[PDB]
């Protein structure tokens, strides 16, 4: 059944190198869904952060339609190993490092719906660059993004669009694996740009990270007040015993330095 349906599709002349045809010659429209699993290692020094997500791409390839209207056949057939299919050569423009998960069987899924609609799902670990602005460092908010776009195909061949409903989703155990920040807001936007090699379509998801204050309250502010307050208890020592005053004023000043360091 499934194995036969797949066989039928590729027994004919099918080229995974050839872009899927369109009715008006328009570009292949790729709908994108994105599921963040974990956002970790938010490096302020190198201004980057890590994040593992599930990319989900969906386009139409009439050449792959087997059931068409179907209603007598399986809704979709799972693409098995050894069958090539044209896929959007998407990459992450602001990715500095990236890995696919391949433990046991590779972590991918490809479905070929009867009408020719393809679903593509893959786990990807990324290390993205996120320029940060520390003007209010102790109490700041940063905005980190993931950019997704085609590398070779221009605006005439491939166009990205965020899924209509819930384009960006978060796994339930994400905020719990992110102790130092609070993921307050997320946004789903377009970053299509015009380059020297052409105009390339591009999506951009953005998360907003609010830095947790409890740490800075306890490790910075509290202890500094407690340090300044100590320098005051020397106002109550007799003006004759200066050794006591200097010892206080100097030790609290030195400690202040260390703390800041």
């Amino acid at each position: 059944s499934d194995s036969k349906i797949l066989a039928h599709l590729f027994t004919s002349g099918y080229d995974f190198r050839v872009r899927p045809p369109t009715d008006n010659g328009g570009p292949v429209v790729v709908s994108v869904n994105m599921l963040l699993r974990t956002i970790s290692k938010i490096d302020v020094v190198n201004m980057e952060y890590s994040a593992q997500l599930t990319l989900r791409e969906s386009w139409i390839d009439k050449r792959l339609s087997y059931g068409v209207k179907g209603d007598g056949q399986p809704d979709f057939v799972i693409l098995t190993v050894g069958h090539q299919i044209w896929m959007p050569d998407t990459f992450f423009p602001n990715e500095k490092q990236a890995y696919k998960h391949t433990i046991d069987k590779p972590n991918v899924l490809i479905r070929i719906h009867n009408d020719g609609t393809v679903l593509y799902s893959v786990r990807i670990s990324l290390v993205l660059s996120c320029p940060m602005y520390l003007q209010y460092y102790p109490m700041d908010v940063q905005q980190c993004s993931i950019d997704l776009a085609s590398y070779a195909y221009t605006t005439k061949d491939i166009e990205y669009l965020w899924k209509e409903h819930s384009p960006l989703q978060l796994k339930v155990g994400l905020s719990s694996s992110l102790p130092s920040f609070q993921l307050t807001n997320t946004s789903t936007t377009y970053c299509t740009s015009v380059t020297n090699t052409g105009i390339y379509s591009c999506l951009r998801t953005t998360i907003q990270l609010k830095r947790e204050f409890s740490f800075y309250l306890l490790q910075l502010y509290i202890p500094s007040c407690m340090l300044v307050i100590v320098s005051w208890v020397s106002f109550w020592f007799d003006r004759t015993a200066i050794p006591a005053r200097v010892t206080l004023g100097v030790t609290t000043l030195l400690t202040m330095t260390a703390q800041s360091a």
């Epitope: 429209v29 605006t155 166009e159 669009l161 377009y190 015009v194 020297n196 052409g198």
Partner: antibody
Framework: EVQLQQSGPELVRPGASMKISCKAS????????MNWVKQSHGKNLEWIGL????????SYNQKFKGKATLTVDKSSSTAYMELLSLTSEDSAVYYC???????????????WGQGTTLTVSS | QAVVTQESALTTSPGETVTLTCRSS?????????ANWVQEKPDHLFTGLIG???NRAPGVPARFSGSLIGDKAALTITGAQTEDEAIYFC?????????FGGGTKLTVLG
């Protein structure tokens, strides 16, 4: 306030070629890409092409491929358009229209120029 | 090739709600057409209104709004004003270039 001021009207004989300008002011010139639109009596509005000031990059309407040559002079915040092998059909009003987004292509129009009237007659 | 179609002209009174439409010849206007709307006041004064995905130009009044009613791009002016009387061009994006419509001449009765 942003402003796009285009060069004055021009009269040129067929076979010749002239270049109209679009001096931008009131915004970071290199951040927004420029469109060029042709409004002729004979037809509707036509989209000639666009250029990204920051990038130098260009993209022409297949129709005007070789008829128009978009360039940009960062120093003076000016966008130029060359028109080669001018003929009767090139007699129109040429507008320049800025793209909406900041350092990225948004595919939507902001401000236009007052237009430049080009007359090609013999 | 592809051609864009608009109402030759429309009429509306101050305060009413008028709707201009933009039709694609190749099919239904989809999001990848990035339907743009441009206004032309007398003396060759062009300015953008709507475009891209769902963004608008700086200063475009709140009464102007875009949508995909039926299978073509729409431009709805809720609470038309006197100054709103102009020529409205819609532009569709086909793969790698823009194609303008004939334009609709909106008249606000006086």
């Amino acid at each position: 306030e942003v402003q796009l001021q285009q060069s004055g009207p021009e009269l040129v004989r067929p076979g010749a070629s002239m270049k109209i300008s679009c001096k931008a002011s009131g915004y970071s010139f290199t951040g927004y890409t420029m469109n060029w639109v042709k409004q002729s009596h004979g037809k509707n509005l036509e989209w000639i092409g666009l250029i990204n000031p920051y990038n130098g990059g260009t993209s022409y309407n297949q129709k005007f491929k070789g008829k128009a040559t978009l360039t940009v002079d960062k120093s003076s915040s000016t966008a130029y358009m060359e028109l080669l092998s001018l003929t009767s059909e090139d007699s129109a009003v040429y507008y320049c229209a800025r793209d909406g987004d900041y350092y990225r292509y948004g595919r939507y129009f902001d401000y236009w120029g007052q237009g430049t009237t080009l007359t090609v007659s013999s | 090739q592809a051609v864009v179609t608009q109402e030759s002209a429309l009429t509306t009174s101050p305060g009413e709600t008028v709707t201009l439409t933009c039709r694609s010849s190749t099919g239904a206007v989809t999001t990848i057409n990035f339907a743009n709307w441009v206004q032309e006041k007398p003396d060759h004064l062009f300015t953008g209104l709507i475009g891209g995905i769902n963004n608008r130009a700086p200063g475009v009044p709140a009464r102007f709004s875009g949508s995909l009613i039926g299978d073509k791009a729409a431009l709805t002016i809720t609470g038309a004003q006197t100054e709103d009387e102009a020529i409205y061009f819609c532009a569709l994006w086909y793969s790698n270039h823009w194609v303008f419509g004939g334009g609709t001449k909106l008249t606000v009765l006086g």
